Coordinates of C-alpha atoms and ligand atoms in Angstrom, one line a residue:
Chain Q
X1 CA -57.7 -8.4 1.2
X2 CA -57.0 -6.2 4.2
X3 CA -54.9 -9.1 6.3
X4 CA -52.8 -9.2 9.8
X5 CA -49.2 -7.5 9.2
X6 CA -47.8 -11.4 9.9
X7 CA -49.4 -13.0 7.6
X8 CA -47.5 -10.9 4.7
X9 CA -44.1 -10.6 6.9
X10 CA -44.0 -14.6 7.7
X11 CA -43.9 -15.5 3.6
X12 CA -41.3 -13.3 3.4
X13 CA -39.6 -14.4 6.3
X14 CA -40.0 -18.0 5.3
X15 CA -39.1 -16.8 1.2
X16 CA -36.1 -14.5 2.5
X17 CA -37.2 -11.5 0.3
X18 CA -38.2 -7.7 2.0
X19 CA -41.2 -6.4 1.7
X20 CA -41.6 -2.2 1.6
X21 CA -43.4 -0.6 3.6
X22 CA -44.8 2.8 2.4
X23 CA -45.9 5.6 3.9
X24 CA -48.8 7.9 3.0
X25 CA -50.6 11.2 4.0
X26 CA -53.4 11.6 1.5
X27 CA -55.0 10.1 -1.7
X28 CA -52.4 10.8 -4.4
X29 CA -49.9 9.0 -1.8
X30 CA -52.3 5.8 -1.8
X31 CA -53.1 5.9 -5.2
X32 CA -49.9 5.4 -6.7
X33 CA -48.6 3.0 -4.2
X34 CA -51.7 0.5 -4.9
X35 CA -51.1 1.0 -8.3
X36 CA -47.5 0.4 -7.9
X37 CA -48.4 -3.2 -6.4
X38 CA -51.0 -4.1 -9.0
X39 CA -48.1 -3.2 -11.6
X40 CA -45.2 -5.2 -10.2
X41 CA -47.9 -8.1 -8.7
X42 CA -46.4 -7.0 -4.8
X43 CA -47.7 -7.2 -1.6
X44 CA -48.1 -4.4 0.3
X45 CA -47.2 -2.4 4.0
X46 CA -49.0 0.4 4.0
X47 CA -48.0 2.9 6.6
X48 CA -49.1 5.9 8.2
X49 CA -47.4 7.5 10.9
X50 CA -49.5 9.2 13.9
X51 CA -48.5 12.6 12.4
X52 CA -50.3 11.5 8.9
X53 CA -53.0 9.9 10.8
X54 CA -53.8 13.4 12.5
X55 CA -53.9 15.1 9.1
X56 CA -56.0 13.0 7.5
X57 CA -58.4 11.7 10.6
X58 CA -57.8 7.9 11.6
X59 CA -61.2 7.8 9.7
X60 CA -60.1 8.9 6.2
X61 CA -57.1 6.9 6.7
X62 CA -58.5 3.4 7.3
X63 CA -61.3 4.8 5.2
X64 CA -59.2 5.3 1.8
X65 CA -57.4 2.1 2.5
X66 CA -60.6 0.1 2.6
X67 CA -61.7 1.5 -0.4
X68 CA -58.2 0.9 -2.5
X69 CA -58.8 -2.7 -1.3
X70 CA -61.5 -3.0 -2.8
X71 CA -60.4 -2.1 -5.9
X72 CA -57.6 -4.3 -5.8
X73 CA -59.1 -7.2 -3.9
X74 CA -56.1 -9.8 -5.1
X75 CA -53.3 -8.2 -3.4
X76 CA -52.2 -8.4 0.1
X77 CA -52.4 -5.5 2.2
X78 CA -51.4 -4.8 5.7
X79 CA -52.4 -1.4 7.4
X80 CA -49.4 -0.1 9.7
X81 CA -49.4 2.1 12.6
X82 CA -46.0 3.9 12.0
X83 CA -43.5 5.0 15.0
X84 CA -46.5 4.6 17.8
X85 CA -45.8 6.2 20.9
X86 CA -48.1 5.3 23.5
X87 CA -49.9 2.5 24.6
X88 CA -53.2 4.3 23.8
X89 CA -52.3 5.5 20.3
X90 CA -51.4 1.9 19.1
X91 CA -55.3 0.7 21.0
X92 CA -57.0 3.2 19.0
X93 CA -55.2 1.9 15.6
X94 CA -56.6 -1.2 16.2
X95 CA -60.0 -0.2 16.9
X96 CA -60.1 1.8 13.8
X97 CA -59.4 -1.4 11.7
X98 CA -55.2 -1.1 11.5
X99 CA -53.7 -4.7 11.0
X100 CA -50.4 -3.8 12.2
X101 CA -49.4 -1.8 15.2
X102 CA -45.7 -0.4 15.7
X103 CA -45.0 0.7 19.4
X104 CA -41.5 2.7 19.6
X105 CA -40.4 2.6 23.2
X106 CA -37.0 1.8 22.2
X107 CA -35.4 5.2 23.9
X108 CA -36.2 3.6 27.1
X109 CA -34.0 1.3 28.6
X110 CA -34.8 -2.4 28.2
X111 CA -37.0 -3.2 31.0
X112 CA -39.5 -0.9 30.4
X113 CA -39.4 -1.2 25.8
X114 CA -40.3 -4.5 27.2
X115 CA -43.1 -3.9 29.5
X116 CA -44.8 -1.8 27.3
X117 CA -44.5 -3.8 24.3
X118 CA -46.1 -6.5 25.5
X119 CA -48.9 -5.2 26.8
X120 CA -49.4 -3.6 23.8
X121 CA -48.7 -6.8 22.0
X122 CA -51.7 -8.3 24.7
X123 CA -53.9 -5.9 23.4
X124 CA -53.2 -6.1 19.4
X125 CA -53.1 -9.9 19.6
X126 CA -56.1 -10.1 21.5
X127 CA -57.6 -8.2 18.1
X128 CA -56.3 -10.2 15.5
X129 CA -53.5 -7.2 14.9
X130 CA -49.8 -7.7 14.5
X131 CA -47.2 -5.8 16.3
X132 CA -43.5 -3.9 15.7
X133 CA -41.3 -3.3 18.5
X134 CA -37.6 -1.8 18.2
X135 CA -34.8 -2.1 19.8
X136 CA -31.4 0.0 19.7
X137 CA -30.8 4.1 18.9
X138 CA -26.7 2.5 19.8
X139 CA -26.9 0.0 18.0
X140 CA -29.2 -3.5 19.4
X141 CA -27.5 -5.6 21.6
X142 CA -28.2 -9.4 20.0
X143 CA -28.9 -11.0 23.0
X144 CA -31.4 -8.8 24.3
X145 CA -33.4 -9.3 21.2
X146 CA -33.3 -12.8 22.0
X147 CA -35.3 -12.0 25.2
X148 CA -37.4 -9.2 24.3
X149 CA -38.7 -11.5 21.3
X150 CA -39.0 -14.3 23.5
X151 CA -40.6 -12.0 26.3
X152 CA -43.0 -9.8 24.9
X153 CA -44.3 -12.5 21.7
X154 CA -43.6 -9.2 19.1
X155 CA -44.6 -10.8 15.4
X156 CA -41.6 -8.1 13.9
X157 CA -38.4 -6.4 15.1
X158 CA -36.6 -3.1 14.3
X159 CA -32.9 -4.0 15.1
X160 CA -30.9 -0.3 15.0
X161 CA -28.2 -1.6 12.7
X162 CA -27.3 2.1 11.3
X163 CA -30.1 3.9 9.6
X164 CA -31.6 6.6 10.6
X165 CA -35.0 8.5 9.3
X166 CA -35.1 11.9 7.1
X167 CA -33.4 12.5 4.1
X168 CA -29.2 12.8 6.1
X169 CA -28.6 9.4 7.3
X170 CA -25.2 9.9 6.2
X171 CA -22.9 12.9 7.1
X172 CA -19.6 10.3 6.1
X173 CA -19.5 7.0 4.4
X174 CA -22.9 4.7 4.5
X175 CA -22.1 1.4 6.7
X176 CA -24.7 -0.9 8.2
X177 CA -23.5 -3.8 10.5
X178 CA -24.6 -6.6 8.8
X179 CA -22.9 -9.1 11.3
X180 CA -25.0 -7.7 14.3
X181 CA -28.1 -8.0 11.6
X182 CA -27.1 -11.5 11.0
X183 CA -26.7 -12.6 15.0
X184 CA -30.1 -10.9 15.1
X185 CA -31.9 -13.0 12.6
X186 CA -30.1 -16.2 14.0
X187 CA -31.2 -15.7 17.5
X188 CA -34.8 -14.5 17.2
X189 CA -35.9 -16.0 13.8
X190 CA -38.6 -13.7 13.2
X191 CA -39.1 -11.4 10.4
X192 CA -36.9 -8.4 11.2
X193 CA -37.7 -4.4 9.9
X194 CA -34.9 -1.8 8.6
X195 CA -36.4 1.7 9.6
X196 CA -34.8 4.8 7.3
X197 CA -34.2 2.7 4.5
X198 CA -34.5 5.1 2.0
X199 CA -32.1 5.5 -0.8
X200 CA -32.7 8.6 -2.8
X201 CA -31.9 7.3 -6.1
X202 CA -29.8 9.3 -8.2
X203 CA -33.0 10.0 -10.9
X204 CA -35.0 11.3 -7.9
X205 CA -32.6 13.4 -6.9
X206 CA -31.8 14.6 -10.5
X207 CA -35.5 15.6 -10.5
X208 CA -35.8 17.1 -7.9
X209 CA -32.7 19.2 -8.4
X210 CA -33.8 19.8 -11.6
X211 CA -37.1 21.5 -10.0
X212 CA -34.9 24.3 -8.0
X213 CA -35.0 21.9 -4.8
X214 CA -32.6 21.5 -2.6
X215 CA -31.5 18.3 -0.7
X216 CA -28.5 20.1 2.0
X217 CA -26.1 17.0 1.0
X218 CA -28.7 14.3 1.7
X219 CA -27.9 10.7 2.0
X220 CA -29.4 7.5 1.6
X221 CA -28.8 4.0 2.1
X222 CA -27.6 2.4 -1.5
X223 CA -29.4 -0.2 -3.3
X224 CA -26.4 -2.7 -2.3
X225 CA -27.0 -2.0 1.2
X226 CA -31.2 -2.8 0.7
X227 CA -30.2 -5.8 -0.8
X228 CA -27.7 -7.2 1.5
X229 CA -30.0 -6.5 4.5
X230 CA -32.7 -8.5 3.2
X231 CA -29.9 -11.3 2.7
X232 CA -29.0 -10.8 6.0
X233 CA -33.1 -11.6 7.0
X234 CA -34.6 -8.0 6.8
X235 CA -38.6 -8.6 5.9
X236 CA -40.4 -4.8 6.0
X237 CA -38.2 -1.9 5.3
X238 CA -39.8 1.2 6.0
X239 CA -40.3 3.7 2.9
X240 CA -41.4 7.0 2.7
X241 CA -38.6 10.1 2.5
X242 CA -38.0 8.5 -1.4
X243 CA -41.8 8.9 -2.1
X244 CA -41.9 12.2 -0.9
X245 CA -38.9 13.8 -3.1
X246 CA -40.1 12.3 -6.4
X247 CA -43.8 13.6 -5.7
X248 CA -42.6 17.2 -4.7
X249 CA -39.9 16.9 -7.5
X250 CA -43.0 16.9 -9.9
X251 CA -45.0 19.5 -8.0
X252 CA -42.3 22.0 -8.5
X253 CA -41.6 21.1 -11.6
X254 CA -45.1 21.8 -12.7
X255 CA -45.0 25.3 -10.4
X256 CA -41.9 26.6 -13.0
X257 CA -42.7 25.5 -16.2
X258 CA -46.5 27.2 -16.1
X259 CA -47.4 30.5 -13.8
X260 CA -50.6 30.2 -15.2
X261 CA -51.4 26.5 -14.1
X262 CA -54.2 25.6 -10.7
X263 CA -55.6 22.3 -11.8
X264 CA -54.3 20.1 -9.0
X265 CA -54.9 17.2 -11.6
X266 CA -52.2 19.1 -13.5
X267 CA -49.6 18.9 -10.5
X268 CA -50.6 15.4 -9.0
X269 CA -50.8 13.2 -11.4
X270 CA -47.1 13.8 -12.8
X271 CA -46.4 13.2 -9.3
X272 CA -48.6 10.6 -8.5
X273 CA -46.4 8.8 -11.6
X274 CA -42.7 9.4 -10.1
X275 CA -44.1 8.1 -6.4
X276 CA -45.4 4.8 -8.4
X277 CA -41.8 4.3 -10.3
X278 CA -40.0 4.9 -7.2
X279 CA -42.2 2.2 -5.3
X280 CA -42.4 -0.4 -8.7
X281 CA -38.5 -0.2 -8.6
X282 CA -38.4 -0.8 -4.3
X283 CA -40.4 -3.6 -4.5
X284 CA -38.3 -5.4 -7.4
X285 CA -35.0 -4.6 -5.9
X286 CA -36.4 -5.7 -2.2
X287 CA -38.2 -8.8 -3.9
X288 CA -41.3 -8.7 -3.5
X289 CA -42.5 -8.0 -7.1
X290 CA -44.3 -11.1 -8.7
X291 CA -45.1 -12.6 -5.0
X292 CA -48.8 -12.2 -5.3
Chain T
X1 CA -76.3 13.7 6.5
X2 CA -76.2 12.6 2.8
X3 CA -79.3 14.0 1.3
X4 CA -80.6 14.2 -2.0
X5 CA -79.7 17.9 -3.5
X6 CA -83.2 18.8 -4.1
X7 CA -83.7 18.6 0.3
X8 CA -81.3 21.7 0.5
X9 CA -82.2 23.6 -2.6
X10 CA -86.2 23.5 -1.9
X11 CA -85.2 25.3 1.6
X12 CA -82.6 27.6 0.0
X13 CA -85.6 28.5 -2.9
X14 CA -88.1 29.0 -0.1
X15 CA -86.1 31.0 1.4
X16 CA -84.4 33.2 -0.8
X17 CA -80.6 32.4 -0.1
X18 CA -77.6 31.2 -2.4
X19 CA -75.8 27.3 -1.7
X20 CA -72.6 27.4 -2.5
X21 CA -71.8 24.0 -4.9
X22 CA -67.6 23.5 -4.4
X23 CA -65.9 21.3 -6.4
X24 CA -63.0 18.5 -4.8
X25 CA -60.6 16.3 -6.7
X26 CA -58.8 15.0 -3.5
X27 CA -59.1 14.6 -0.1
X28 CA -57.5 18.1 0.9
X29 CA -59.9 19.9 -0.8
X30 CA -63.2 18.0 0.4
X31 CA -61.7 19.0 4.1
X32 CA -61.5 22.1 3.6
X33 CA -64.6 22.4 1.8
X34 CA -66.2 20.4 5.2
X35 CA -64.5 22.0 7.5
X36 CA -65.9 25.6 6.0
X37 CA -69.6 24.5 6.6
X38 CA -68.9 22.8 10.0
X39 CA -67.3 26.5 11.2
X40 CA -70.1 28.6 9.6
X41 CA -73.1 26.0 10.2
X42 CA -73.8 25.8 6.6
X43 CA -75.4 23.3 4.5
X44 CA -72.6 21.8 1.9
X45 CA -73.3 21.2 -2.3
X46 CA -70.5 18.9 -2.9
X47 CA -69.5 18.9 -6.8
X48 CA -67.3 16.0 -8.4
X49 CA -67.1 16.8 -12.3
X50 CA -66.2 13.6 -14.6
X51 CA -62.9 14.6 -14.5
X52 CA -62.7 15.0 -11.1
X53 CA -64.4 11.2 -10.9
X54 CA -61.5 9.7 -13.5
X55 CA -59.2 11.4 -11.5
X56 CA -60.7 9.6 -7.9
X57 CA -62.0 6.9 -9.4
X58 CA -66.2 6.9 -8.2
X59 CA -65.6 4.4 -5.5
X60 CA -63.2 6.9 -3.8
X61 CA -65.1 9.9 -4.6
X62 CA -68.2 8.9 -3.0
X63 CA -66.4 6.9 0.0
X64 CA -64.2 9.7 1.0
X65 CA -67.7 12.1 1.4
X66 CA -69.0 9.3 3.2
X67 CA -66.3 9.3 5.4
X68 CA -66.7 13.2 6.1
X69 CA -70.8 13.2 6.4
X70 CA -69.8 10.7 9.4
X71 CA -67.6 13.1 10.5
X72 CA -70.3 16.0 10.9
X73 CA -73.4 14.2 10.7
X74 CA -75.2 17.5 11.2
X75 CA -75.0 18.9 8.0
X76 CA -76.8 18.3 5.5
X77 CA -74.2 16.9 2.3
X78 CA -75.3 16.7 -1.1
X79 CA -73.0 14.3 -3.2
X80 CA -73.4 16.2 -6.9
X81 CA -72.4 15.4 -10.7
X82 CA -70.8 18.3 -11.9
X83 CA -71.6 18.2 -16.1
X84 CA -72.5 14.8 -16.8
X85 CA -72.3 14.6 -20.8
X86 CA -73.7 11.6 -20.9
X87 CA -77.2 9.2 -19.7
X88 CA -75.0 6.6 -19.2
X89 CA -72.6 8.7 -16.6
X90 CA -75.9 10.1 -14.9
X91 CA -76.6 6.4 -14.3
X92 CA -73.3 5.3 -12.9
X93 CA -73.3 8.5 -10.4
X94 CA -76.3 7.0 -9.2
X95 CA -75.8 3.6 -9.1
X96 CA -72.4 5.1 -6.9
X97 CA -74.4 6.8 -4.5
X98 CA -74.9 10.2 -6.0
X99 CA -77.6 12.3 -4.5
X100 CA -77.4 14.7 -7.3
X101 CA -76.7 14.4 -11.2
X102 CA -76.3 17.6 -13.7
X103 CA -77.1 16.2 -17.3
X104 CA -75.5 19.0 -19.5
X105 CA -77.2 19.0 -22.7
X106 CA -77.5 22.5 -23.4
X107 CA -75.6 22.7 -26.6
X108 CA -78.3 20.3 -28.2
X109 CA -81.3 22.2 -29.5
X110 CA -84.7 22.4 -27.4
X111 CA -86.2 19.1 -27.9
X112 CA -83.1 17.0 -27.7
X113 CA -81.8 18.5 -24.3
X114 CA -85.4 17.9 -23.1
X115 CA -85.5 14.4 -24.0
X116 CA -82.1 13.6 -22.7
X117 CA -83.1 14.9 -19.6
X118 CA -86.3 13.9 -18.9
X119 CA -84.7 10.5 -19.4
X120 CA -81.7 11.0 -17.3
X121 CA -84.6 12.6 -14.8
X122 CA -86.5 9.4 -15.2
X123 CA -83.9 7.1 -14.0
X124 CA -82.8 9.6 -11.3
X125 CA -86.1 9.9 -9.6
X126 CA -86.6 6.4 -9.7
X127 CA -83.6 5.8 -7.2
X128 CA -84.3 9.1 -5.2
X129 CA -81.9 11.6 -7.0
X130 CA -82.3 14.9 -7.8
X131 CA -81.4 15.9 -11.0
X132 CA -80.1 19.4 -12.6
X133 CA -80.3 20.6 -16.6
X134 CA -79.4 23.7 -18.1
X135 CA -80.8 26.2 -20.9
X136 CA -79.0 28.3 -22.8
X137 CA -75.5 29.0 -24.2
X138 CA -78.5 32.9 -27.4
X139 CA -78.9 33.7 -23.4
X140 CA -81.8 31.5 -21.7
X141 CA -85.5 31.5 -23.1
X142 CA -87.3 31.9 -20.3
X143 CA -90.9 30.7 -22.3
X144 CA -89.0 27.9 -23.3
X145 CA -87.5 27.6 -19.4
X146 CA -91.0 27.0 -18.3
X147 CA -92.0 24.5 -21.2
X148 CA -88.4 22.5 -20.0
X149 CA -89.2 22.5 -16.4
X150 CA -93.1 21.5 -16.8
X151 CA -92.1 18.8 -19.1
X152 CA -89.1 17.4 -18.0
X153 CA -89.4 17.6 -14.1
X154 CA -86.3 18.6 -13.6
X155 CA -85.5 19.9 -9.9
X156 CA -83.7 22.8 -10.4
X157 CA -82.2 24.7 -13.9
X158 CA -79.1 26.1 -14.6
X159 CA -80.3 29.1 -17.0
X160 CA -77.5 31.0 -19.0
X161 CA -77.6 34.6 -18.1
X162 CA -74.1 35.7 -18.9
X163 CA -70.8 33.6 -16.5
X164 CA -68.9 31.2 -18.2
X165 CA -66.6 28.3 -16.4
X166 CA -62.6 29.2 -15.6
X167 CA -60.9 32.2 -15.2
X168 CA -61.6 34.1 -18.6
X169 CA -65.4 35.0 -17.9
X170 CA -65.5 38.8 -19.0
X171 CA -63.0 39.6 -21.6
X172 CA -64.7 43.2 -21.1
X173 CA -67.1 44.6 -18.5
X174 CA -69.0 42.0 -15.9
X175 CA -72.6 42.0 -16.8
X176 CA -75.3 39.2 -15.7
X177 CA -78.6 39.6 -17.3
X178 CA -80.6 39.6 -14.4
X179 CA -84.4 40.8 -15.6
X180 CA -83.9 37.5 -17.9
X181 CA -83.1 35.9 -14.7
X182 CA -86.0 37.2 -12.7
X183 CA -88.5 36.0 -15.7
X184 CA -86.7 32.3 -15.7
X185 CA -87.7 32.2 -11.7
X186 CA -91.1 33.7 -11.8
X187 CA -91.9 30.9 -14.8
X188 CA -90.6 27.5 -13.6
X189 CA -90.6 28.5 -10.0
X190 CA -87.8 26.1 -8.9
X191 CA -84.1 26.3 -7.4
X192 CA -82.3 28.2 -10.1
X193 CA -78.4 27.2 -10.6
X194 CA -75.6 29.8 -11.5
X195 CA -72.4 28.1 -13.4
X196 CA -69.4 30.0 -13.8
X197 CA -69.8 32.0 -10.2
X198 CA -66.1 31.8 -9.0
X199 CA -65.1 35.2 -8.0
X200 CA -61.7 35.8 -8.2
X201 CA -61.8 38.5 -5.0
X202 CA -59.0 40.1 -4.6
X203 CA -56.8 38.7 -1.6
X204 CA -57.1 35.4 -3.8
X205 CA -55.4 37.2 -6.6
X206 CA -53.0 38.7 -4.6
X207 CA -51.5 35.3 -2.9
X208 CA -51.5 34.0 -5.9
X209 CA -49.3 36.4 -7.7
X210 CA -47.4 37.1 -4.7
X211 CA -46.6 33.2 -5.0
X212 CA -45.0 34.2 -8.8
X213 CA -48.3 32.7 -10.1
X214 CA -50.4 34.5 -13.7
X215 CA -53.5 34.8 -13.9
X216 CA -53.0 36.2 -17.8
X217 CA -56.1 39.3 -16.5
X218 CA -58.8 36.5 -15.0
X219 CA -61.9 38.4 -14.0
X220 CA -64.6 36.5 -12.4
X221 CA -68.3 38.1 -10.8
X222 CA -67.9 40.4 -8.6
X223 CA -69.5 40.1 -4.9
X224 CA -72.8 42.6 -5.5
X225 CA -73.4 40.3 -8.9
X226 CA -73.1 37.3 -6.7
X227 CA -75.7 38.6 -4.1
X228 CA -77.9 40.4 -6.9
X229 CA -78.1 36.9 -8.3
X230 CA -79.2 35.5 -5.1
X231 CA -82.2 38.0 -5.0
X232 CA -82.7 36.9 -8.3
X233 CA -82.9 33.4 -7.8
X234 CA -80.0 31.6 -7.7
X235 CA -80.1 29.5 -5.3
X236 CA -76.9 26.8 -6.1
X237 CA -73.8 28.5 -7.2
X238 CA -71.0 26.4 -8.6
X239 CA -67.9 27.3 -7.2
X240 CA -64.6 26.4 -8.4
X241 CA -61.8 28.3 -10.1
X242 CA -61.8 30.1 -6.9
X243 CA -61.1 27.3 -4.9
X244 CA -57.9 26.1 -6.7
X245 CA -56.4 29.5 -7.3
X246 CA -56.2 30.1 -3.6
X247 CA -55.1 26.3 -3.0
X248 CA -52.8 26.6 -5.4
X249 CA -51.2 29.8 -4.9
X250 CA -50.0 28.5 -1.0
X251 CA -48.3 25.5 -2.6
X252 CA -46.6 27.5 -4.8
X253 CA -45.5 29.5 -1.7
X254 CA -43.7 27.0 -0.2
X255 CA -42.0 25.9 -3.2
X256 CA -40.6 28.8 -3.6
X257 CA -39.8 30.5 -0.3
X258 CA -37.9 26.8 1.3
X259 CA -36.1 24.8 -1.3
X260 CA -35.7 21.8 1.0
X261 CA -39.5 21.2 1.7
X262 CA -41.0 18.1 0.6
X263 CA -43.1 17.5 3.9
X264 CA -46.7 17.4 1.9
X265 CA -48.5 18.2 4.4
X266 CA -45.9 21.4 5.0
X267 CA -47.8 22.0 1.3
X268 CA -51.0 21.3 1.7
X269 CA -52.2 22.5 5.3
X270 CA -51.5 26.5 4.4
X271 CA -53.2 25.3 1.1
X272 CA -56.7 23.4 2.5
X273 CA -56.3 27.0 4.8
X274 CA -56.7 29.3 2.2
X275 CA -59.5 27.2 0.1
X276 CA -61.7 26.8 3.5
X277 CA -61.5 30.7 3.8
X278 CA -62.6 31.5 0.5
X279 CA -65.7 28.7 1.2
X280 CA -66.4 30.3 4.1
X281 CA -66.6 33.9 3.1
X282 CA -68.7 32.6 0.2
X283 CA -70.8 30.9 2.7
X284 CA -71.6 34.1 4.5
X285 CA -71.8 36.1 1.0
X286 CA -74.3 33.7 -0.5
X287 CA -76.9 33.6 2.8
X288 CA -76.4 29.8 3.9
X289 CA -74.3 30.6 7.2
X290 CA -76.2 29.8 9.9
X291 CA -78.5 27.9 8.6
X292 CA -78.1 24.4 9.7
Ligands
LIG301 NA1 -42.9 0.9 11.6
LIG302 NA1 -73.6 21.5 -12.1
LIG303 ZN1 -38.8 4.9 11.2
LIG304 ZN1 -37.3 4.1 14.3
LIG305 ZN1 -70.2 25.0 -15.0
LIG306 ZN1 -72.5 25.0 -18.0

């Protein structure tokens, strides 16, 4: 069942549990997050951002995502336009069968994030299709997402509350301000999204370490921190620089260990493995496992 | 389009060219693969072994050519069974949408492999399918060829005149029996199929031990065998090893030359590069460039 981002987001915005979002680029990617969700009984976000969505065709990615629905019929499954950054990209998401549409306009200044998030929210709603909007870089002002919610009729927020994408979120100490997450919540009471929530668990780091990688001091947000931001009424948290150092962890692993070794079945499906654990254990820390 | 594999073999055997038949286990490889044919205006033998379909899962196999015949509606696609071992996985490749089954038989002696294919031929025919067999191991009879093809109806043969699957094909000299060949075509007068036809050309060895890979001395056909076999016959030439070494050998590029790299795509673009070259050389090579 291929349903309207909102109508996952709401149950957990009513239940008060998070739901990841996960992002893919290819089959391997899908695979093991479906299979992740059929394991822990979890609905699912799956995202792809516009750069993914021009590697694999918008095509193969609706395409693939239909298919895996299929399969698993019984779970719930939203298809997310990741980090959309134009009125015309989010429009052709939704015409190629995307439930869920993110529009990131929040580097302009408020008057215009509005604008255009409403009229892309006129054109998704108009389609059955949910929509994202974010506000903050600094970090949101509480009050304005009181009007932009009000305003524009966005189903989900992004408050900047400290993250930040990539695998360096953190060049000190992590802190997230969970007061202005909290005012957030109170004033728009809508389900609210945590972009760069990644944690790099120490085991996928180990591995990946292990393989002769190299992660330049990286930094992610701790499992504490996850779990108090869904306390403090975070619904979606967007997923995606985990999965990709526990599937390359594998990959190179493979690489040293046999010279002599080309079956990609041979690479991928030890990786296809570590991706699945690393989205099993996100979606019983966030909350979401057994929700089906 | 999607076309039974007997539609592009009958032209290539009236004609006197070579089809290349490439293998896929995921999505970057059956780009590739498409994207070759689209740049050289060839016709495409797509080949999914049962691995290959446990790996996928059929659903996905067969959806994700789908999606890429809608992509290029122009060429003609042939969906293939790569060494079906059984009746019963003939019938579920057809049942999935299969346009081509191999039933692989030849290790049975001369009347079993003809019944089990004349029933797998049977049930293939009967839903519009083309179907492939294969003679030999003691080299093809090519007497008993013309018996199997007049009896069983098979639409094209896979007769053993020397190659063997993988890497290890001539632990000596390289030497196809091509008068045995010649005999084979002039008897049963049909599309003639050449297993074991990877390559190895040179460049493709070169990345891939420039990449710290081992190929532990892999020799595969040369090019003149190739093209001798062509004006033999052969007119479907499976196509494999080749494909992964030159995927795999980018891959383990990256790994090793940035540390920090766990973009996939940062993997798999230079790697989907490489395998569509090696297609479309092969392409030009075998005769079917150019002839969409
Ligand atoms: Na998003
Ligand atoms: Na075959
Ligand atoms: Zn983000
Ligand atoms: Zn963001
Ligand atoms: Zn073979
Ligand atoms: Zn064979």
């Amino acid at each position: 069942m291929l349903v309207k981002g909102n109508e996952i987001l709401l149950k957990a915005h009513k239940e008060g549990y998070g739901v990841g979002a996960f992002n893919f680029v290819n089959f391997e990617m899908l695979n093991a997050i479906f299979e992740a969700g059929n394991e822990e009984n979890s609905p699912l976000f799956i995202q792809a951002s516009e750069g993914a969505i021009k590697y694999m065709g918008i095509d193969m990615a609706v395409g693939m995502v239909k298919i895996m629905c299929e399969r698993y019929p019984h779970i719930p499954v939203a298809l997310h336009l990741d980090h959309g950054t134009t009125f015309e990209s989010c429009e052709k998401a939704v015409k190629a069968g995307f439930t869920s549409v993110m529009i990131d306009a929040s580097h302009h200044a408020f008057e215009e994030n509005l604008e255009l998030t409403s009229k892309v929210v006129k054109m998704a709603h108009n389609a059955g299709v949910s929509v994202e909007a974010e506000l903050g870089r600094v970090l949101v002002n509480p009050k304005e997402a009181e009007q932009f919610v009000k305003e524009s009729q966005v189903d989900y927020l992004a408050p900047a509350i400290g993250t930040s994408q990539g695998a360096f979120k953190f060049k000190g100490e992590p802190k997230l301000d969970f007061e202005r997450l909290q005012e957030v919540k109170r004033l728009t009471n809508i389900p609210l999204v945590l972009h760069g929530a990644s944690a790099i668990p120490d085991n996928v780091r180990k591995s990946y370490l292990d393989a002769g990688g190299d992660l330049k001091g990286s930094k992610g947000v701790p499992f504490e921190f996850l779990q108090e931001s869904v306390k403090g009424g975070i619904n979606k948290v967007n997923t995606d620089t985990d999965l990709r150092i526990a599937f390359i962890a594998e990959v190179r692993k493979v690489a040293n260990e046999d010279k002599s070794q080309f079956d990609l079945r041979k690479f991928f499906s030890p990786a296809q493995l570590a991706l699945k654990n690393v989205v099993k254990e996100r979606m019983k820390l966030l909350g979401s496992a057994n929700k089906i």
